Amino acid sequence: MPLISSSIPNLINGVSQQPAALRLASQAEEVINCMPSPVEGLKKRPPMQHI
Amino acid sequence: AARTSFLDAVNRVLQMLGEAPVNSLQGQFGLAKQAEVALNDVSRTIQTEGWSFNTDLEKKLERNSSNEIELSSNVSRVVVDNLEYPDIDVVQRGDKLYDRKNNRYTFDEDLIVDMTTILEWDLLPEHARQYITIKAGRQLQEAIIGSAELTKLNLTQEVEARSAFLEEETTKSEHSMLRGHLNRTSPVNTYIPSRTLE
Amino acid sequence: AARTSFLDAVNRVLQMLGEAPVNSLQGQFGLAKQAEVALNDVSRTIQTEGWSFNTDLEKKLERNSSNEIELSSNVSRVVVDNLEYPDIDVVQRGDKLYDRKNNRYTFDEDLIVDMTTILEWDLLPEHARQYITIKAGRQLQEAIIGSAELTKLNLTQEVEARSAFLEEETTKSEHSMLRGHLNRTSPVNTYIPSRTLE
């Protein structure tokens, strides 16, 4: 038993419908109201103003 | 803080395996049933040896109409006194006794034997509960995952638990070497050589 | 600087596990449940062995209307002196005593026994609290994480804590060999061969 670890490098790859055994581990499962960008990573979506 | 209960023991086994605790035991949807099975199996394995709390002495056994001795479903071992019965010796076989010297399944009168019973989880005392819990946890973990270092750690804990259990049993029952076989009523005073000299 | 509290013990267990300390116990949103169950289980395991701070001497027990002795919920072990009752052999079973020799659940008279109780957290003394905390932390870390270096450090700390707790217990309760069985009222003077020669 080796107690060993990895890491998830990026969270900027969105949602996939493939079975979990064929995806890139980076890909997520359900994304709502996020704005994934390469300049700051994952963040809450910008607000919507009124005119 | 009461004595250990079935749900607490199941949760402890699951936690020792390393998996999240359960809420109840009825209508669950996890490994709790397998933990229960392992607990029962280890309980049977430990109880089938014969200890102070599950042995009945001087017990009298009764025969049925066909001159046979029948045993309950939870009887583990029986012993007859060779000195008391010189011409008959019995050995357990399934649920009936066999007079192996006379090669017969039938006896002539009743017997006075020593009986060991396998008990349910409710009647078990505290130290037996603890030993059973630790042993079942170790065995189930080995059966499910199959590591080696985890087995080493569980072996260390099991050794400590067995030491505690044996110490508790020998402190409770107060065995002796002078008294001989316990089927004879105690004539010993065990008079103390240490104190009464002043 | 008062004695250690339950929240301080939980914080110490979490810190030894390697996590951040938690604010409270009530309505926690963290590992408080795991820390609490670990501490309770280790407290019960330590208490069920029987020490000088949780044992009562020559306590009287009273039977019910059916000549049956029923124990409380938190009674761990019951000892009956053999010499005082040469015809009765009892062993604890669940919450009732069992007349092992006569194979009965009934008695003929009240008894004088010495029992061991399991105490709540608030009523424990300081050395017991320290030993309980350290052992619980070690067990929780070993079961949950399973690393190497943390296990080594916890092993060393547990060994030191056990040494300290045992030493404190023995110097508090002054166990002796000359006095023999403690149920006898002290006839000993323990006169000192190291003083009166001048």
Place this chain on the structure above:
Amino acid sequence: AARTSFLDAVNRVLQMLGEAPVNSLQGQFGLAKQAEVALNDVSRTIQTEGWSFNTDLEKKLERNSSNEIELSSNVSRVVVDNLEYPDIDVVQRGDKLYDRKNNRYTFDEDLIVDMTTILEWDLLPEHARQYITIKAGRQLQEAIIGSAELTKLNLTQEVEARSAFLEEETTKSEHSMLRGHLNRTSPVNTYIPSRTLE
């Protein structure tokens, strides 16, 4: 909590092997055939040695119309005392007894022999069932998978099981050295030096 059954035994063997537990024995679609054959073979290997629970004393054998001693098909070994019969040396050969000294298959009179029988799974006692189960599991895993850590774990478990089984057998069968050959009816009293000096 009744005694262990065949289905529980095969489930335990599969669990030791590391596979998922199987449901039934009849019309199975798993390793049930291999587990059953391993259990049967280990049971036969253990039973052929001869113990105290499967041996008949001073049993009488009868010859056929041609002065030939035909044994049953589940007779493992036959022992004939030399001192009683000083002119015949009998050894087992297949299913009939052979006169080694005289080089004949024919006898002159019936014999009084001590013979061992192979018992079915239903009739075995609990300790025999436990030891047989553990040994069969170890053998099957060793011959089928052949890994290292599993082999060492099964080795430790088998060693513990053998110790327990041997101790249970000896305490059930009260073997002695003063009595001599067990064929004689007990003239022994085993007067204990421990008791009667008061």
